[PDB]
Amino acid sequence: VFTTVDNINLHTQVVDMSMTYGQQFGPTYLDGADVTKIKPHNSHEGKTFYVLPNDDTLRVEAFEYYHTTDPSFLGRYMSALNHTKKWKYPQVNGLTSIKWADNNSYLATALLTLQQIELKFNPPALQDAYYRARAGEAANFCALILAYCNKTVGELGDVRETMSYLFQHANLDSCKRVLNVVCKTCGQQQTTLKGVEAVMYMGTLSYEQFKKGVQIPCTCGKQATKYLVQQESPFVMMSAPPAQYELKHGTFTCASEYTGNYQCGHYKHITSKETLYCIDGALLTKSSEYKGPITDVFYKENSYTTTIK
Numbered sequence: 169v170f171t172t173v174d175n176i177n178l179h180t181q182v183v184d185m186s187m188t189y190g191q192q193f194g195p196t197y198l199d200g201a202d203v204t205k206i207k208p209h210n211s212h213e214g215k216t217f218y219v220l221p222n223d224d225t226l227r228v229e230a231f232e233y234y235h236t237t238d239p240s241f242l243g244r245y246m247s248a249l250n251h252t253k254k255w256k257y258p259q260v261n262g263l264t265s266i267k268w269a270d271n272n273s274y275l276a277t278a279l280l281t282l283q284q285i286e287l288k289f290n291p292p293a294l295q296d297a298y299y300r301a302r303a304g305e306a307a308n309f310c311a312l313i314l315a316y317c318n319k320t321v322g323e324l325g326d327v328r329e330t331m332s333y334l335f336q337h338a339n340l341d342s343c344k345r346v347l348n349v350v351c352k353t354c355g356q357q358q359t360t361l362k363g364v365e366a367v368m369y370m371g372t373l374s375y376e377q378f379k380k381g382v383q384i385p386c387t388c389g390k391q392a393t394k395y396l397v398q399q400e401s402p403f404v405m406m407s408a409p410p411a412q413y414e415l416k417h418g419t420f421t422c423a424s425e426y427t428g429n430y431q432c433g434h435y436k437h438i439t440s441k442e443t444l445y446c447i448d449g450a451l452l453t454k455s456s457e458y459k460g461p462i463t464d465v466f467y468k469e470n471s472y473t474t475t476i477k
């Protein structure tokens with residue numbers, strides 16, 4: 169029998185049927201399933217089991233693969249894998265999606281988004297899982313996302329919360345956003361964001377509107393105008409409270425629709441390819457135009473410098 173924490177460095181161990189896996193190894197999982205209360209079977213010899221990082225070597229390996237120090241991570245990860253592996257991951261419109269189960273609509277929408285933006289995860293667990301998931305095997309990636317976000321299967325989620333959590337574990341250091349807020353009493357004031365903060369915004373969905381200028385409260389009492397001075401990033405995420413919004417073809421990359429409230433709701437994913445495709449888990453519907461309660465819109469960027477002198 170073998171044990172590991174990353175499924176990359178494996179360790180050979182001893183087969184003894186009298187003691188539960190929990191008494192010999194500690195908490196043990198086989199392909200997600202909690203076998204801690206189980207004693208070893210004759211058919212298990214040679215398989216790979218996961219265990220918690222109790223050995224100092226396993227601590228190091230788990231940190232290098234998952235980029236977290238949380239001891240419970242693996243536990244949570246494995247618990248999530250017990251469900252994500254049962255889900256169906258149909259190909260829909262050239263992307264990997266999830267047939268609806270366990271309120272996963274936010275997860276399916278985040279999954280489709282991740283497959284359409286240029287992102288480079290730093291943790292190897294995530295890089296490996298990402299490439300597997302882009303090809304259709306997305307159980308591990310979804311379990312890892314649930315784990316990194318401290319969400320459980322069935323638990324309610326926000327697509328923006330998920331994307332932001334994950335961006336933290338991505339190489340966005342080269343990203344840069346220069347803004348300029350212009351109040352008529354306070355004057356002009358410029359700011360520069362780098363990293364994760366440069367690729368997200370909250371307040372408006374329209375990126376063209378962010379470039380033209382958006383009204384925001386100022387402390388003096390007036391409304392100030394914030395406009396985008398410079399964007400250096402592979403993508404940009406714009407969020408806003410759900411509202412009826414008209415997605416025009418060729419003007420965005422993809423978008424999150426949300427119907428419902430803080431208690432109960434359902435997420436749909438819209439993407440602009442050669443026309444507007446609406447991916448509701450395993451369901452797909454095409455349309456030339458789309459109007460819906462949008463809350464996230466994702467745009468592609470390379471380098472932008474404002475024309476406002």
Ligand SMILES: CO/N=C(/c1ccc2cc(OC)ccc2c1)[C@@H]1CCCN([C@H]2CC[C@@H](O)CC2)C1
Nearest residue numbers: 324325326370371407408409410426429430463
């Ligand atoms: C009722 O939804 N309102 C929302 C909201 C509010 C204010 C916002 C302000 C923004 O900045 C200007 C940007 C985005 C905003 C989004 C979200 C969007 C939909 C998904 N989440 C989940 C959160 C966990 C659980 O409660 C289920 C819903 C709620």
Ligand SMILES: [Cl-]
Nearest residue numbers: 428429432433
């Ligand atoms: Cl409802």
Ligand SMILES: [Zn+2]
Nearest residue numbers: 351354386388
């Ligand atoms: Zn002011």
Ligand SMILES: [Zn+2]
Nearest residue numbers: 428431432433
């Ligand atoms: Zn309800």
